[PDB]
Symmetry: C3
Subunit: 314 residues, 3 copies
């Protein structure tokens, strides 16, 4: 099965300039060459060039709405096409607002997909409930059917069409939710495993339930949107919104080793790596290294080892 990488060096969903240098640090760490070592074929589409929208006034409280919308509508066109040619898309970005295009474009081709959203945040604030004008906590509000017509249309997102329902997404690692967001997840009946649920069941029992929830009835493609801040700041410090008490390096890997075993991984997101926020060089390398290990695990690199087939090593 083919794998195609797509760079999304975009950072208008957040105050923090810097995340536009993420695909570059990842690529700079051997991400593309290591992928060729698996049993997959890798092609580097290359970074996208988002055309800046001038005089992009703020919509009420939301910042850079049109720049984020047009830049997203663009990832959408690229993902759908690559999905079209039966290939797995791996988007290296930028802040998490790029999940609007990455997930919608994926659903155009595979409308029966489900979403595993590993994050310390629910990123489900609507244009109204936000305390900031930051779109990095709103992507999911633009993707859910149940949330359509619940908030005024944001200039730049009329091309989006809520594709997945609150029932086709699962949250993993939550530990920082806004009163608004929590009220939404409780009202919509969204399946989630916050840090306390993970403490109770153990990552193993968790992954084993999300699969019988999403894949229980009918097997379907899986979209894996990974926000580096789902892991504790000790492993992935280079993120703009780190929160203590996160998933560990080991649990991080476990989620990706299990999602591979399903043979359903259709789309992948590695968001929020900001190389300019590592207080010291050590921190960044740490964030980039664990980010590369998560991507490799989604495509075969297991912790027990790996020996090429039809080969007798003796």
């Amino acid at each position: 099965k083919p794998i195609e990488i797509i760079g999304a060096p975009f950072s208008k969903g957040q105050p923090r300039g810097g995340v536009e240098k993420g695909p570059a640090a990842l690529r700079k760490a051997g991400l593309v060459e290591k992928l060729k070592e698996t049993e997959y074929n890798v092609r580097d589409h290359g970074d996208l060039a988002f055309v800046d929208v001038p005089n992009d006034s703020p919509f009420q409280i939301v910042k850079n709405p049109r720049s984020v919308g047009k830049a997203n509508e663009q990832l959408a066109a690229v993902v759908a096409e690559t999905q079209k040619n039966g290939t797995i898309s791996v988007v290296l970005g930028g802040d998490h607002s790029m999940a609007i295009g990455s997930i919608s474009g994926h659903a155009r081709v595979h409308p029966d997909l489900c979403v595993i959203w590993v994050d310390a945040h629910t990123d489900i604030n609507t244009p109204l409930t936000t305390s900031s004008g930051n779109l990095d906590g709103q992507p999911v509000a633009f993707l859910l059917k149940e949330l359509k017509g619940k908030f005024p249309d944001v200039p730049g997102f009329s091309w989006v069409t809520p594709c997945i329902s609150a029932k086709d997404i699962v949250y993993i690692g939550l530990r920082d939710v806004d009163p608004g967001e929590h009220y939404i997840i409780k009202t919509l009946g969204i399946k989630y495993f916050s840090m306390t649920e993970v403490d109770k069941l153990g990552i193993g029992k968790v992954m084993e339930e999300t699969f019988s929830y999403l894949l229980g009835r009918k097997k379907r493609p899986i979209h894996l949107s990974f926000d580096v801040d789902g892991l504790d700041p000790v492993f992935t410090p280079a993120t703009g919104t780190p929160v203590v008490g996160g998933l560990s390096y080991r649990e991080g890997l476990y989620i990706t080793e299990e999602i591979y075993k399903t043979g359903l991984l259709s789309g992948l997101d590695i968001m929020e790596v900001n190389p300019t926020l590592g207080k010291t060089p050590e921190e960044v390398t740490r964030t980039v290294n664990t980010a590369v290990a998560l991507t490799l695990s989604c495509f075969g690199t297991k912790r027990e080892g790996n020996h090429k087939p039809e080969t007798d090593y003796l």
Copy 2:
């Protein structure tokens, strides 16, 4: 239900001067304003002023006996009164010797209470078995009935009356016990989950057993005495007696999210925060922050989120 905070800036139970600045660092970190954001009513009794006892000679090996005894008899009078008016007491202290007054005064009003003692130490040395004259590892020896008349009366503690039995207390996080203490817990049949028990069962299974042990037969108020050193030195470094291999930030929170769900939390202790022992400013803030998060969790702040009731966020 009402919550009433009580500052106990006392440090005569230990060599280490410094823990008298704890209630101040916690209050300085938003502890009282954050509490007002829950569904409880908070009232700040303020710090107590312990009158120093002159010529407080040592009793055998025990240090400052009368200063610790009179200072304790004082917390006792304050807790009982606040408990009286049907309010939950939250004592910000000092070293852990202040658990004598905090727990005895609580039992005067609620004699059927049980004690959950999260700590890396059993603090059950009697005046004889101690290797030091430090009362921070003796509080529990003054509170157990089974240990009355087992050691000579220490000048200053004749006002105490062993209230709870070895069967109404449970230990969580033990990983540093004295030959004397371990012998006592094995002879009295005290229920405990040392670090190895937590490794075996997982914090979840643990909390689920201590509740069927203490609350199994009859439901009764719960006293939660939290010694910051129960958590690994990585999360709460600012403690005079740190021990590697402790409960984690995540497990720490889990214990407090579970004790809330019971609806029984009657008394709370946040002991051993010593703002003057954090090698760097980072360390203290880290100790104070996790200390605040533990207190907020005992009163509703969950990791899955929180949305005020009778409020439609859409």
Copy 3:
């Protein structure tokens, strides 16, 4: 039961000069005096003096064949003798190539023994599959029956005779295996718990299965070969081949508290402590301290406490 310590300051199994100062740093940390505090009798055989072999030409790709072989044949003569006199051998070494003599000499006396191999590596490369001429990842290939005659005889190892079968060894902590090694463990049917298995079952469930696997049918002596690099680089940094995502200080201890409870610990190995690779003094002390705590736990030091018998502390 008697305990006898044996220093193996050897480092010809690796490029990295330095591990010959391990027994010295451990002894320098109170390892021998702390052991006398348990209910065992400790005797310090002292360090061995390995006679260097001159003109020790490389065998194909393997380095210092004869120096490693003759130095091993020597540990073999010392372990067997001490085992003979019904004593528990505790070898402080060197790189992990010294497990050839330590395990073979143990089997001469107890041929029905089983091996618990805690390591981040399988150290099962044969002289052919290695990418290096390093013997610190080949010890197990010289000890298995099933692997005899599968590779040319290495000058210096004619004295060894594969004693245990692939079915009498269990791996704990694997997270760095070579295509060659993994192929071998899958072909021989060797029982192992890689880091992902430990994440799934929890250390507790793991130790509970390795015991019903090795000790299920017949009870027999146990050989415990501990490679400090089985623990994450945070706890034991002073190792030549550290790998992220390791067992923790807590899990490390749990494995040793459980192996004691069996009453079968016959032989112990504490390999790979290299005092000269700790970037800062903090790192070494950290490696040595956790190394001492693992040895003490294998002989009684529990985390719940310890009170001498027939003693009334009241």
